[PDB]
Design a binder for this molecule. Sequence first.
Ligand SMILES: *[C@@](C)(CO)[C@](*)(O)[C@H](Cc1ccccc1)NC(=O)[C@H](Cc1ccc(OC)cc1)NC(=O)[C@H](C)NC(=O)CN1CCOCC1
Ligand SMILES: *[C@@](C)(CO)[C@](*)(O)[C@H](Cc1ccccc1)NC(=O)[C@H](Cc1ccc(OC)cc1)NC(=O)[C@H](C)NC(=O)CN1CCOCC1
Ligand SMILES: *[C@@](C)(CO)[C@](*)(O)[C@H](Cc1ccccc1)NC(=O)[C@H](Cc1ccc(OC)cc1)NC(=O)[C@H](C)NC(=O)CN1CCOCC1
Ligand SMILES: *[C@@](C)(CO)[C@](*)(O)[C@H](Cc1ccccc1)NC(=O)[C@H](Cc1ccc(OC)cc1)NC(=O)[C@H](C)NC(=O)CN1CCOCC1
Ligand SMILES: [Mg+2]
Ligand SMILES: [Mg+2]
Ligand SMILES: [Mg+2]
Lengths: 212, 228, 195, 195, 204, 222, 222, 196, 196
Amino acid sequence: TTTLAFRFQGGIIVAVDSRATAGNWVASQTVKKVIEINPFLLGTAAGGAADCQFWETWLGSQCRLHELREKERISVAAASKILSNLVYQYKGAGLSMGTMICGYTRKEGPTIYYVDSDGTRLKGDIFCVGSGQTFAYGVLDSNYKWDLSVEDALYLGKRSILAAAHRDAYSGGSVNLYHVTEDGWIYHGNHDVGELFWKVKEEEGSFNNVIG
Amino acid sequence: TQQPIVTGTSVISMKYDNGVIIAADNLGSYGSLLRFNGVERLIPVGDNTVVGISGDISDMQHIERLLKDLVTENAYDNPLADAEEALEPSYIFEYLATVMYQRRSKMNPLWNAIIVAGVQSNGDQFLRYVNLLGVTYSSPTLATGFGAHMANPLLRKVVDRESDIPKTTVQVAEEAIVNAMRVLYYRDARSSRNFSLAIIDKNTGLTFKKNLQVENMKWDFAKDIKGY
Amino acid sequence: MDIILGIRVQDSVILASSKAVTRGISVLKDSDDKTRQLSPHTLMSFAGEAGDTVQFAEYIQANIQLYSIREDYELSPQAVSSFVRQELAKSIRSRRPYQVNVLIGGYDKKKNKPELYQIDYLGTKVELPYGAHGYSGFYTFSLLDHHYRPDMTTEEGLDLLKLCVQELEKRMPMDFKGVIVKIVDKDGIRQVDDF
Amino acid sequence: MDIILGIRVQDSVILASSKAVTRGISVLKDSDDKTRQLSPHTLMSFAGEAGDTVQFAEYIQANIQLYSIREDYELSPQAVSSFVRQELAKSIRSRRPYQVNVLIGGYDKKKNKPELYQIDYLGTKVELPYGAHGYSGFYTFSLLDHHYRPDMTTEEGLDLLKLCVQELEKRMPMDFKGVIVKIVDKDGIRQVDDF
Amino acid sequence: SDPSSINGGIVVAMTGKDCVAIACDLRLGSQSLGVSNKFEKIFHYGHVFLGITGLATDVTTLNEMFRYKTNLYKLKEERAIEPETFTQLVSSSLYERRFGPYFVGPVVAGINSKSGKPFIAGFDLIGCIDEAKDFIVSGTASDQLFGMCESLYEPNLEPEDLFETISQALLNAADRDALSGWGAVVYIIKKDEVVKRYLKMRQD
Amino acid sequence: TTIVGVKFNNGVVIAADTRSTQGPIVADKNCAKLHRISPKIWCAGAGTAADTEAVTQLIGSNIELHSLYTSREPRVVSALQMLKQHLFKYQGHIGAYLIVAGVDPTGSHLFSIHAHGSTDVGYYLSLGSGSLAAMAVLESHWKQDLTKEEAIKLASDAIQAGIWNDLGSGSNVDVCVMEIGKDAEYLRNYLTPNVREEKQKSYKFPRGTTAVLKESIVNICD
Amino acid sequence: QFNPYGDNGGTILGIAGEDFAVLAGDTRNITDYSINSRYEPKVFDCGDNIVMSANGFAADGDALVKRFKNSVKWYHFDHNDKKLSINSAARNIQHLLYGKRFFPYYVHTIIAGLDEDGKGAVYSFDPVGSYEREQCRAGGAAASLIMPFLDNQVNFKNQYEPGTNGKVKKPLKYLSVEEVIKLVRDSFTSATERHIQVGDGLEILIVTKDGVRKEFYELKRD
Amino acid sequence: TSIMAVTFKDGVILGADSRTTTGAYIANRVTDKLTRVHDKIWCCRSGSAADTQAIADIVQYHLELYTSQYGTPSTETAASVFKELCYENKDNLTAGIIVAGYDDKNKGEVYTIPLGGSVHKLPYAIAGSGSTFIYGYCDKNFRENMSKEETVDFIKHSLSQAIKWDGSSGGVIRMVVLTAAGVERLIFYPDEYEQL
Amino acid sequence: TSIMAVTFKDGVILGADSRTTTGAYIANRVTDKLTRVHDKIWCCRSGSAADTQAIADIVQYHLELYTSQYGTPSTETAASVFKELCYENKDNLTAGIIVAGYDDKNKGEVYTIPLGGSVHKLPYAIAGSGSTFIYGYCDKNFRENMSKEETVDFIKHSLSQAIKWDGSSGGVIRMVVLTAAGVERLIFYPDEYEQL
Ligand SMILES: *[C@@](C)(CO)[C@](*)(O)[C@H](Cc1ccccc1)NC(=O)[C@H](Cc1ccc(OC)cc1)NC(=O)[C@H](C)NC(=O)CN1CCOCC1
Ligand SMILES: *[C@@](C)(CO)[C@](*)(O)[C@H](Cc1ccccc1)NC(=O)[C@H](Cc1ccc(OC)cc1)NC(=O)[C@H](C)NC(=O)CN1CCOCC1
Ligand SMILES: *[C@@](C)(CO)[C@](*)(O)[C@H](Cc1ccccc1)NC(=O)[C@H](Cc1ccc(OC)cc1)NC(=O)[C@H](C)NC(=O)CN1CCOCC1
Ligand SMILES: *[C@@](C)(CO)[C@](*)(O)[C@H](Cc1ccccc1)NC(=O)[C@H](Cc1ccc(OC)cc1)NC(=O)[C@H](C)NC(=O)CN1CCOCC1
Ligand SMILES: [Mg+2]
Ligand SMILES: [Mg+2]
Ligand SMILES: [Mg+2]
């Protein structure tokens, strides 16, 4: 894995790769690492695959029960804390999860929470999580400004995953883009690295290390 | 977590046209010490099933008691206990297979390898294997321990697939089993000369043979062999 | 030791190397120069096990300087890099191997081309447009994949390098106390004093 | 987590805590507040194992806040510190102990005196004029032994604290991304925004 | 710390009608970090081609070593070494380091200049010769390559057809291995002409 | 591996399967495990593949030099002595398990050698992962005073037992017959009972299927 | 110390068409270097047009299939004989597997059938419950051999349109049941050649709206 | 292994089973564990087959060279050469050897050499895994100055019991008789000795 | 330990040495390893002294309670109770027990229970560290339907050899005779048995 999500002028961008690994064996190239909890909440998946898939869909069930009981959509803080308190109960048992709870509510505004399997829970504007997080940080940090346009922000997220997909051996497949606004999340397509790399190389003039 | 102490070696078996044959030697080994020589490792259940057991003997004796108790329990409130509602080989097997897998799942296994041979009520031959891990499988020929390595190759020359079963008589099948037992005596360091053999036929029923011996052995060429 | 970078541009090779020397819970020095001049147009930066690094660098330096005097001629960067690789390739199957990773930046005067070689302690050599050793590469490679162009100037290369150092200072766990930058071109080797 | 300091002066207690949250080779956050307000005149800073720290701090916070509501009264710093110690003293012989070290800075309104308590994960409590947890103490204790006086003002205490942070930034191996400073006195708890 | 899977890479070779093909990927990494996308693993000494997978320092060392040995061979014999003879030289040299071996998976390919017969061969790290009519595979995606070659291959393929078969074998095998890929090269070898083609493949 | 050796009337026959493995993967489907030490002394090898090849060549080389030195045809006991002393010296680290057989002026012989350097004598022997499957057949069907054609049948049957029942053995059966007073006949692929069936489909791709970036002529000449 | 796990070998394969789906698996069962059975089926009809296989450790595999079959039964009892959809069956299986997250079922599970729009569906699982719908999946010992072949021949990966300069990809299209069975048979014969734990026989279960049909084919027994 | 050597009136007799094991598998059921190092000096081999074989070959070489220079060696001399090899290489060897020989002056002699490499001259000796089961029997039944037929029976009955209880022992019972008359090889098959 | 139990014409006799060891030190040279679980049901104890003692005490309690309700228990019943404890607690026990008893219907009976917890009914049984050295002797010398004097000699000679070879066995030879007549305790000192 490589997953990122950053806050900016026009809301939140969330971008993930789609590769699954079993050692050096490429298990899948078409995995969904973003889970749509509700029209205003997203969850990213990094680490152990069943762990992420099982507990994040479980998280969605707890969020649904909240809005049934409280007649109100759960806050990003409360949603993230349900998940962090859960994994803390399993601390030491060997769960492997690197997650980001992204979403919008009225009281909070656009919010991102990093939650991992040691029980670390952090609010923040920028996070990159997974085996290729460093590669994504390299591109994202060096190009990030708060005043990015929706168009430029979408691309930077896409380009940052591509950067990690290229260098990190345990990342790749395709890029899944999302954009979170006050009106909810919007899906911005699946982008296969097979075509996206050459399209980016040609148009951007980057990736000069590769034989053109 | 166990370690086996007093142990039994190979159990071998095969199908033939009208039924099944099964055999196992009468030894209870204590490591390299050939401690006990009067051990029966074939245990009949009713008049239509024989259970052959290898591995730990204390665990074998426990399984004996379970089968003994199963016959008693089946007879309770059962007017057809000796007819339509008698214990089938398939019932006895599934029961053991359940126990074996439950015990391995509790990290406290019955340290055995088991072959259930018999004939079903509709005349069909039954032959299936189960071990300490709860692993199960069926085949025209089945064998445990060294038997798997040495007996199966010989028995598979007689019955290589399903279509070879109707073509195999009880005379041919028993001859192959007795031959295999001799080969095991030559080559298995924890085997004995004395053994038991059982035949379960759909017509003649259960024939249990005790106190058999390996015979017609080739040892004479030994005199010609000198040094290394 | 820890951070050593390298960038080859149109007309020069730029090497950046961290100044910190740490041991236990103390930064013993913050002005350390992790490099040796092998010849007038060849520079080698190094990083790895304490002691091994300097001992190896100076040993190579002595050998190249000996060759220069003997033949009254400067070895090509390619030739020096192959010599260094072979020494490390011997080393790895010794009783106690040199645990040193190096970058060799040089200007080939016959070809009029800059050259950057990355060699690890196993003796694994590769020519690259940009290189790094240790954890640095996990940030800089992807960054350079994006921002690097082959026809850049030395000034453009230094700005590209500043972008790397800023990213490392932001995301690396350890304080490496900045870097010493050196440029290798047709006119030889010189140090950038204000970085 | 890593660096947490504390200094008790004439009329206040000052707590300094690092802002970095690092995990592997990445600084995930550089603005983290490693503290919780237990009561209006009691502040607890913390450091240790990931997850355990915040989980423990908030658990204590909940308990003290519960007491405050029940009795409509604020517990003394001494009382809070003894409660915290006992929780850690239980913890250490549990199946999975809290691996958290804490500093408790408070102002006792009945005595009109500032108080600083240092408690480690074993449940080892000591009242001190100045305290630290982790590797920080190996630099700051000797420094404060020299420069500390008991009758200092809050401003003098902050300058004394700046002297500590400068020394840590110079000699510590890791980048801890500066500190968040907070002052506990007769008027409660407030944060210094420009440090 | 398993020498054969630190750097990563793959090589494959095939025979056709009066021709042979040998192909390799271009990746060199340090475990998860991809470092170089130009690292070729196929070399040649006269008309005999050698591919080498495994630990990259040994790949380089052995190339240099066999260049050394084939150059002296040619000077003393006054002729180019043949694939069958070179195969024996590789085996001797590897077994010389029996209890401190080079962590490699070499593959010989070429056409005998005298008989005109296509020839391929593979080795383990310790020298055991694996000769084959059809194909040889090597590297971190050897399982993948075995599966591709065993299904896709047919005998007596024409050079142009053989190119498609070997290229598809390598590409699809590489895409299922994390440590292989990042570009690829294919050599088509006829009796007296050799074509070298760089393949377009996914760069992740 | 599965390898056997069987003695008969006027000589000795050895046989072997042709599978080579790396873990669960079949590396070679038709490898040669029968090795010539001298013209009339052949060796079947099991264990570490390179070791059986190297040790048999080294001793074979030294046997040829010895035969030229003494002006005599080499003896099986010489190969046996040289092999066991070599293997013993390496305390089992050279993982070669060999069945040594042949004819010489003394007569016909059959031995086995283990990696640690112990040697056995016998009329019928089997080594390798499928030695138990083979030995089962040998123990069942072997008798004194076998003919040539009977011994070949018994030997190939013992290898077949390994081929079918042992996962470490497969493919074809190689045989080598060493009769007294005659040339040794090496029967490569004596049986081939594992031919691959016709594939359901041809996977010949349309020309141009593969995307190419660059082309170039390679220079192989001087 | 007692080791509760074992490896029973074999390999399985699932392919989905437009109005059908196949789940294939070899019939060989092994431990170490011994063959236990040449015909021991591990692809099962579980009712509601769902076929299932759990390959790896057979004791765990049988246990899982047994539990899922029972899950289908109680689904009917508790929800008025409602048909269990393939997507619902997949999620249920995730909970069965994840239920033993800290003492896992050592199996790679594949199920196949039709979705609620009548289109072919294949779902695949890891040992602890993670799952994903795909057109294509191989599982088990020889998965690494077969899977890349499927990427190439089912999803047309790395295949471009001839003469388009590697710019236009080969278009995706569904395969006929005749074409899919050809690929399955070729996949297994290829895997049997190079993997020692694969062979003996091939059993394919085909699933259409009409029901579940079977087909059996011989494989090499070495 | 079960092995033994017994002195008697006319000389000495060596005895051994014929089983070689690799684990519980019998690698050779017709092994010859009685090996000639000189005309009338033989030894019984127990422990590692490879080690005992390599030792016996070296001893045979030493005694052949001894004979070329100094004539027939004593049985004590042979035992000393075995000891020297076993003692000096004790860390790398697993060999329990019984040396037995016939002189005309000294008559029958038996020397046993355990794992350590120590030498022990005895009237009779037993060794190998199966010997543990017959210490009681052999002690109660051994007499000095037995006849040939009595000694053959003593060995046959002893090894029969050792074979019966030890799984690592079996096959045929080989024996070698060393007297002034010469060297005689004897063999005894299961059908005879099992029902003793 | 060396221990044994032997059935004969009039009933059964138990036999044992008297040595208890903590390493190579003899903690007790006059130990009583023959213990009463019922009037005419006794057992020989080998293995851990603490384990066998704790087991024997529980069995004695079970059979006393059995007798209160159902009268005299059979020897088989006693062996079953021993088995139940040994089998179900096999992971935590090191106990090799021989059970011997006299019924009037069943006469003399011997049941041996090794480490695993399996049961084996035999004409005679031997156990303990020193038993290994007398398998050969006991097999060759045992006969069914022996007299009292013959059986006493058989046990005395057997344990004498076991003691002679086993360092973990020694002291006096205790015996317990179980017949219709009653219970008789016998003792035999070194000065007698050593020179047999
Ligand atoms: C990248 C690829 C690096 O792994 C991502 O972290 C990726 C995230 C992801 C999220 C949702 C769905 C698929 C993939 N993670 C993986 O692909 C993951 C890597 C991993 C394996 C094992 C781990 O130990 C807990 C941690 C991470 N791969 C898997 O989970 C694979 C598919 N399954 C297994 O390895 C099965 N194991 C899991 C642990 O328990 C034993 C069985
Ligand atoms: C059967 C196939 C064993 O499965 C035979 O013993 C066969 C013998 C043989 C002889 C000549 C030519 C071909 C084959 N042995 C092998 O195929 C052998 C299997 C084996 C692997 C590892 C072993 O111990 C570590 C022992 C036996 N295969 C090989 O030697 C292959 C070619 N090489 C390797 O697996 C790599 N070796 C390198 C040396 O170190 C051990 C691993
Ligand atoms: C009886 C059978 C067991 O002790 C004898 O001692 C017998 C003696 C003998 C056999 C043949 C020819 C002459 C004498 N010994 C064996 O059969 C022996 C058992 C043994 C193996 C290893 C030992 O420690 C090194 C000690 C005893 N068997 C062998 O030597 C066989 C041929 N080889 C192996 O089992 C391979 N060994 C090599 C050493 O490391 C363990 C694997
Ligand atoms: C002979 C001497 C040796 O086996 C007998 O088995 C004898 C039986 C006996 C002794 C007294 C009373 C009735 C029966 N056993 C011992 O003397 C026994 C030796 C032994 C110790 C530990 C064992 O494993 C647990 C097995 C055998 N000695 C003891 O039990 C003495 C009293 N205790 C110790 O040595 C202390 N042990 C406790 C267990 O852990 C090791 C240290
Ligand atoms: Mg990648
Ligand atoms: Mg086979
Ligand atoms: Mg004593």
